[PDB]
Each structure stands twice: as structure tokens, then as C-alpha cells.
Amino acid sequence: ISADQVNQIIYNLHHDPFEILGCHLLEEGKNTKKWVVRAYLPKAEAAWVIRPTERKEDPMNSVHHPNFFECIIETPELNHYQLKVKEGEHEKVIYDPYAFSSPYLTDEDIYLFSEGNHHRIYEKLGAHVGEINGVKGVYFAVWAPNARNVSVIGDFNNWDGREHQMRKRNYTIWELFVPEIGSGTVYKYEIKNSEGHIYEKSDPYGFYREVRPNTASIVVDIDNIYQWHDEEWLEKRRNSDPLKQPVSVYEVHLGSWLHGSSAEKMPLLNGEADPVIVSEWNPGARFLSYYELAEKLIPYVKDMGYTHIELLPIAEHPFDGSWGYQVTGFYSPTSRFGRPEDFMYFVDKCHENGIGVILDWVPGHFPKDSHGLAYFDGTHLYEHADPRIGEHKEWGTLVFNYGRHEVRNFLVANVLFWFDKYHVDGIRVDAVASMLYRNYLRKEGEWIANEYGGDEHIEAVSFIREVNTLLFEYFPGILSIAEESTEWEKVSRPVYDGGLGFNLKWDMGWMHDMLDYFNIDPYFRQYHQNNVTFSMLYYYNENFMLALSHDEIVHGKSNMLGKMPGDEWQKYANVRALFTYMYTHPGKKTMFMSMEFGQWSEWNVNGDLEWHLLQYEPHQQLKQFFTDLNALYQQEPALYTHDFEYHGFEWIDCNDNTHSVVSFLRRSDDPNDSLVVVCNFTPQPHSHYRIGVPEAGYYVELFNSDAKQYGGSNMGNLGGKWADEWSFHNKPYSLDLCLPPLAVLILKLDPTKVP
Numbered sequence: 001i002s003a004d005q006v007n008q009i010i011y012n013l014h015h016d017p018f019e020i021l022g023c024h025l026l027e028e029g030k031n032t033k034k035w036v037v038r039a040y041l042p043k044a045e046a047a048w049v050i051r052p053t054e055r056k057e058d059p060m061n062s063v064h065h066p067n068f069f070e071c072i073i074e075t076p077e078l079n080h081y082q083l084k085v086k087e088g089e090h091e092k093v094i095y096d097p098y099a100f101s102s103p104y105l106t107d108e109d110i111y112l113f114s115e116g117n118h119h120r121i122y123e124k125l126g127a128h129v130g131e132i133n134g135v136k137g138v139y140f141a142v143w144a145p146n147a148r149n150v151s152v153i154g155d156f157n158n159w160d161g162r163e164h165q166m167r168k169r170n171y172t173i174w175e176l177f178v179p180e181i182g183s184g185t186v187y188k189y190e191i192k193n194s195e196g197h198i199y200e201k202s203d204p205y206g207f208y209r210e211v212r213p214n215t216a217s218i219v220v221d222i223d224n225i226y227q228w229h230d231e232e233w234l235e236k237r238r239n240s241d242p243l244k245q246p247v248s249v250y251e252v253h254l255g256s257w258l259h260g261s262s263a264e265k266m267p268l269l270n271g272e273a274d275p276v277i278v279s280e281w282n283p284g285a286r287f288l289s290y291y292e293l294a295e296k297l298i299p300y301v302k303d304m305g306y307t308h309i310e311l312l313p314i315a316e317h318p319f320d321g322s323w324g325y326q327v328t329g330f331y332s333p334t335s336r337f338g339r340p341e342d343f344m345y346f347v348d349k350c351h352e353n354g355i356g357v358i359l360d361w362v363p364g365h366f367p368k369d370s371h372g373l374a375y376f377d378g379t380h381l382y383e384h385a386d387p388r389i390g391e392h393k394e395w396g397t398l399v400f401n402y403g404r405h406e407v408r409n410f411l412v413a414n415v416l417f418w419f420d421k422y423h424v425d426g427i428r429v430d431a432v433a434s435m436l437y438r439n440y441l442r443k444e445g446e447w448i449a450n451e452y453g454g455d456e457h458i459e460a461v462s463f464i465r466e467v468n469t470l471l472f473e474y475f476p477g478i479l480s481i482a483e484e485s486t487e488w489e490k491v492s493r494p495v496y497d498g499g500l501g502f503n504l505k506w507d508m509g510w511m512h513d514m515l516d517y518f519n520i521d522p523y524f525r526q527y528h529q530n531n532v533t534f535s536m537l538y539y540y541n542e543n544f545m546l547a548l549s550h551d552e553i554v555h556g557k558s559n560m561l562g563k564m565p566g567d568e569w570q571k572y573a574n575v576r577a578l579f580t581y582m583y584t585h586p587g588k589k590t591m592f593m594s595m596e597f598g599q600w601s602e603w604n605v606n607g608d609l610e611w612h613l614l615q616y617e618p619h620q621q622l623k624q625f626f627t628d629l630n631a632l633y634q635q636e637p638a639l640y641t642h643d644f645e646y647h648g649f650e651w652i653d654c655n656d657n658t659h660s661v662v663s664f665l666r667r668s669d670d671p672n673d674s675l676v677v678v679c680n681f682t683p684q685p686h687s688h689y690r691i692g693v694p695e696a697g698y699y700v701e702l703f704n705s706d707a708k709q710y711g712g713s714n715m716g717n718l719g720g721k722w723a724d725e726w727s728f729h730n731k732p733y734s735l736d737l738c739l740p741p742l743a744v745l746i747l748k749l750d751p752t753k754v755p
């Protein structure tokens with residue numbers, strides 16, 4: 001480029017910076033092409049072009065001015081890249097702001113989408129504010145290749161689409177530009193199918209939607225509604241390995257954590273809306289907005305000391321009682337809680353408070369509601385046409401056709417969309433088995449095998465691998481968490497090693513072993529010591545997340561206190577012993593709202609949590625217990641650096657079944673960070689109980705779940721114990737401990753203690 005051109009850009013004299021900035025073809029070679037990417041990055045000293053899907057990264061060079069950058073790259077296609085921008089000591093990674101010079105679909109957009117590889121398809125399908133022919137308006141586009149006609153109906157035309165008939169491109173996608181409308185426009189698509197039947201659909205790629213049970217889509221100027229402040233969070237995330245960090249998740253259903261009064265408006269970020277009543281049966285209650293949740297949930301979680309919030313599905317869904325697991329608006333956060341920018345504010349405030357956001361994401365099916373994706377254009381478009389692979393009959397839902405390019409593209413671009421536009425830090429996928437098996441919940445003679453004669457759903461496996469490959473390429477540092485309940489192998493292993501590419505898997509076996517164990521009267525746990533220890537036998541085959549979820553405190557299963565045997569004191573003590581064991585056992589942690597304060601009732605999705613319980617001491621003490629345990633967890637490296645290495649754990653003794661005692665070490669990089677954990681899972685106290693330890697010295701009683709401030713009896717070792725030179729459990733030294741009833745101790749050597 002010339003210095004004249006560069007200076008036109010620097011000084012805002014250039015007539016159209018997209019001529020020069022962005023990605024431009026320079027020349028074609030025999031088997032490759034030469035491109036240049038240019039960027040004007042005021043205040044950046046350095047920049048790079050990352051090609052994350054090729055695992056490449058190229059520096060940019062200043063050209064004529066220190067903040068004008070160019071990068072020449074030879075490759076056959078340069079469709080997928082990011083800019084890394086360094087401004088002083090800080091780096092950010094962004095999409096190129098000059099990537100798309102028009103709002104309409106290009107030939108290249110259509111080709112990429114037809115092949116299933118358009119990772120940013122949501123920039124062109126849906127509804128986008130823009131300019132065509134010199135006039136501002138909204139561009140709409142929708143994939144409906146077998147429709148006879150499609151028209152845009154909405155507020156702007158009184159729901160009569162005759163003068164807003166779309167134009168079909170390349171026999172596949174319909175488009176229309178509508179001048180002089182903008183964000184907040186309410187619309188649907190009116191489709192006529194091959195039989196002539198006329199019906200109405202919400203936008204598959206819509207970014208916002210009316211409040212259930214109304215279904216119109218709403219235009220969002222998605223890139224001009226919110227200013228983020230989380231660059232330092234995002235940089236730290238990119239440059240860190242979450243597997244080696246504390247990860248303590250507070251699982252939340254946003255619709256049922258806390259309700260407000262329906263007698264007032266729902267406040268939003270700088271505005272308000274009509275209240276959303278929770279149900280006709282509870283009409284004085286309304287949902288809280290994403291704004292109000294930022295103001296209340298976030299400081300609550302920060303005070304409790306969790307590292308992450310995991311949300312049950314927030315994509316738009318028509319029925320509260322699905323809990324979010326039956327989605328019809330994949331590209332929009334539910335309007336129950338306000339607007340897209342209110343959820344952006346929620347995530348930005350989590351990041352400001354050093355809290356990550358994990359979304360439950362639901363790619364496995366969709367319901368049959370007429371407004372949604374079903375039979376979209378008069379053919380089985382999103383779902384497979386064969387009900388033996390295209391329906392989950394026991395659920396009454398439809399299964400995406402994962403092998404169809406445009407359908408795979410809808411879902412793969414959708415997971416990226418939440419990381420891109422909403423900055424989230426992870427996803428969790430429920431019921432991964434539903435996707436992986438062609439015979440899932442199907443009777444003999446009602447499914448067919450794969451091309452090789454097996455029961456593996458090959459197209460679904462390919463799709464899941466693609467999702468996790470892309471996600472970690474574009475957004476290193478995230479969490480991709482699976483619940484898979486059939487022992488499919490290598491769930492949380494890299495795709496190149498034959499894995500599915502998640503980085504964490506819920507340890508459902510552990511959860512069942514634990515909850516079944518603690519439900520047993522303590523005298524009988526001696527016949528079930530194996531429930532305590534078994535899950536370590538397979539532990540290192542996956543990277544496990546120890547999750548006690550919403551699914552375990554519904555449908556007659558009781559909330560945690562109610563699962564426990566004994567009198568009230570003992571029920572609380574069992575909860576504290578179980579959770580202290582959970583937080584000291586190798587693996588990351590997840591627990592669901594209400595578990596942290598001892599709600600007695602099961603979770604009810606139609607009301608809010610029983611907050612009034614926190615007026616009373618026993619509930620206050622249990623919440624203080626979790627607050628302290630989460631603080632300890634973040635403070636003690638041996639509880640998180642080596643979860644997934646042999647080094648990080650070793651049993652001391654797990655043979656004392658008649659007293660339901662087990663003990664173990666956790667370790668980290670520094671030997672002085674090793675912890676001794678001792679568990680007593682009966683109410684019998686032990687005044688003298690010897691435990692083998694590896695070093696001489698004074699072992700401080702770092703945590704004791706029977707402390708009085710947690711509601712316990714305050715039994716224990718009064719600060720700690722000096723080790724005896726008395727060989728025990730095959731170790732050269734040993735502690736003669738007092739074990740409190742229904743309790744866990746954590747001890748730690750203090751090598752500086754004065755004898």
C-alpha cells in the first residue's frame with residue numbers, strides 16, 4: 001500500500017476504508033492464493049493474524065505508520081481468522097472489524113454455508129441493521145430451499161407481506177432488504193410450502209423474541225447495544241489452562257432462583273419493561289431481569305466464593321416447565337428476563353467480579369412447536385425425515401439431521417455465537433448419549449444400524465467432534481463439559497486421540513455412589529465402603545467434574561437434607577461431610593442453588609427458592625460452611641493443580657469399613673502444600689485414631705466440618721497435632737487424631753512451627 005493511502009486512513013480522509021482494510025486477494029497461484037490482511041489499530045504496538053482452524057499465527061508488520069498493519073498470507077482460502085492486538089502490556093483477540101463489507105449474502109457466504117463451514121453465518125442469516133443502495137434498513141435472510149414463497153410480515157406492514165415478498169438466491173436462501181426500519185422491529189416469516197399451505201415462523205437466527213407465549217422475532221442491532229469491559233478477564237482466560245485452576249460451579253435456573261413483585265415494572269439496564277408473570281397460578285410474582293440478576297445473583301455468588309455460575313438453558317424456549325431443555329429460539333437469550341444487552345451486562349459484570357459463565361447448550365433435539373424449526377419449509381429440513389433417527393418418541397421431540405450441511409452449520413455456528421457475542425466461558429451438554437446412539441430409547445426393530453452395522457450415530461459423533469475442535473481453536477481457555485451416561489470412552493479427551501473433545505465430564509457414577517451412600521443409615525455404611533472408594537478406580541480415564549445437580553433434587557428424590565438419615569443435627573452433619581469430601585476428592589466441583597443453605601423442599605421450577613430459611617441459624621451456619629469451603633478451595637493448591645494427575649492423590653487408608661473412615665493425601669507442585677484428609681462417616685467420635693503421614697512435624701487442623709460455626713459439635717484437635725515417629729499405614733510418621741462425628745478434617749504440615 002502507499003503512504004498516501006495509509007495517511008488517508010489515519011486521518012479519516014479515505015472514502016471507504018473497506019477498500020484497504022480487512023482481507024484482500026492479491027494474486028492467485030497454481031494451488032494457492034496470496035492475501036493481504038490490513039488493520040488500523042490506534043494505540044496497538046503489535047498485531048498478529050491468527051488462523052485458528054489451521055493452528056497458524058502470523059505477525060503483522062507496521063507499514064508507513066506505527067499503528068497501520070499489514071500481513072501477507074498464502075493459503076487457498078482465508079475465510080476464518082482473528083486479529084490479536086497488543087496495546088501496551090495487554091492483548092485482545094477479535095474478529096476483523098472490516099471482515100464484511102456488505103450486509104447481504106455474498107457468493108462466498110452461500111458456498112461456505114452450503115458446505116456447512118460458515119462459522120459466522122449468523123452475521124448474514126437472520127435480521128441485521130445495515131445499508132443497501134444508500135438507504136438504511138434491515139436485511140433479512142432465511143434458509144428455506146423447498147418453500148414456494150416467503151414473505152416478511154411484521155409491525156411495519158401490519159402483518160401483510162404482499163409488498164415484502166423475499167427473493168430466493170441460489171435455490172436455497174430467501175432474502176429481503178426493508179428500508180427505514182431498524183432495531184425493535186417485530187416480525188415473522190410467512191412461508192408458503194410446495195402444497196400451497198401458508199404458515200408463520202419465528203426467525204431461526206433471530207436475536208430476540210417476544211415473551212412466551214408470543215413468538216414474533218425482534219430485530220437487534222447486536223453489535224451496537226452494549227459496551228463491554230472484560231478484556232483483562234478474556235486475556236487471562238485465553239492464556240490459562242482451566243483444568244489446573246479451582247473450578248467451583250454454582251448451578252442456577254434463572255427463572256426460579258428469586259422472583260420479584262408483578263405489581264411493578266421489570267427494571268432493565270437503563271430502562272424497564274412490563275413484568276413477566278411467573279404463572280397464572282402465582283400471579284403476584286414476576287421473573288427478575290438479567291439486570292436485576294446481575295445486581296443480586298452476582299454479589300451473592302461472589303460472597304459465597306464460587307468461581308463460576310452455570311445456567312440452565314437460557315436460549316429461547318416456549319415452556320417454563322421444560323427448564324429450558326426444549327429450545328425453539330437458538331440464537332436468542334430468553335426474553336423472560338429482558339433484552340440481549342441485559343444478558344451482556346450480566347456476563348460483563350460476572351467477569352468484572354472474577355466469575356465465569358457456563359451455559360447449558362441444547363443441540364440434541366428440538367420440540368415440535370409450530371413457530372419453531374419443525375418441518376420448516378414444508379419438508380423435514382432441520383430434523384431427519386426418518387423418525388427412527390429423527391424423533392425422540394419417548395420425549396415427543398425432533399432430532400437434528402447432523403449430517404446435513406446447513407443443519408450442522410446452524411448448530412456449530414450457534415455454539416460459537418454464544419462465545420463471540422456473549423463472551424461466555426463454557427458450555428455444558430446434557431444427555432450426550434441421546435446424540436451418540438442410533439438406538440437411544442428405541443425398541444428392537446424400531447432403529448437401524450449405522451453403515452458398519454453398529455449402533456454409533458456417526459453423523460452426531462462427527463458433529464460433536466467438530467464443535468469441540470472449533471470451540472477450543474477459536475476460544476482457547478474455555479470449558480466444554482459433557483454429561484454422558486453410558487460409559488462411552490474418551491469423552492473428555494482430544495479429538496486427535498479418538499476422543500469427543502470435551503475437557504470435563506460429569507462423574508455420574510460418583511454422584512450415584514455418594515448420594516446412595518449418604519442415604520444409608522450410618523451403622524450400615526460399613527457394608528458399602530466401596531461406594532466411597534470405587535470411583536477412583538476409573539477416575540483417570542476422563543477429566544471428571546463432580547456434580548450434584550438440579551436433576552438430583554426433584555421428582556421425589558428430596559433436597560440434600562432430606563436425603564440424609566438421622567435427627568436434624570445428623571442430617572446437617574451428613575451434608576457437611578459429603579460436601580467436604582466432595583471438595584477434597586479429586587475433580588472439579590458443581591452444586592445447584594438451594595444446596596448451599598439447606599433448603600428442605602425439592603426444587604420447584606414454578607416458585608423461587610425458600611430464602612426465608614436464611615433467617616434461621618442452622619441454615620446460616622451451613623451457608624457459612626460453604627462460604628468457607630469455597631474460600632479454602634481457592635486458597636489450597638493441592639485441591640486444584642493436580643486433579644487429573646496421579647501425583648495429586650493417594651489413599652492413606654481406605655480399609656477401615658467397620659468404622660466408615662477413609663483418609664487420603666492431596667498434593668501440588670510444592671511438597672509443603674500437601675494436605676491430609678480424614679473422613680468419619682458415622683456419628684461415633686474417635687478420641688484417638690491413628691493416621692499415617694509422610695513427614696515429621698506439626699499438622700495444623702486447617703478445616704474441620706464439625707466446627708461450631710458450621711453447626712457442628714466443635715470436636716477436634718484444638719489447632720493441630722504433632723506427628724509421632726511411629727510407623728503407620730506404611731508411612732514413617734503418624735498422627736494420633738481425634739475424629740469428630742460425621743465430619744471431615746483437612747490437615748496441613750506447618751514446617752515453620754516452633755517446637
Ligand SMILES: [Mg+2]
Pocket residue numbers: 159160161
Ligand atoms: Mg396476509
Ligand SMILES: [Mg+2]
Pocket residue numbers: 431
Ligand atoms: Mg438425564
Ligand SMILES: [Mg+2]
Pocket residue numbers: 528
Ligand atoms: Mg453396592
Ligand SMILES: [Mg+2]
Pocket residue numbers: 607608609610
Ligand atoms: Mg418464594
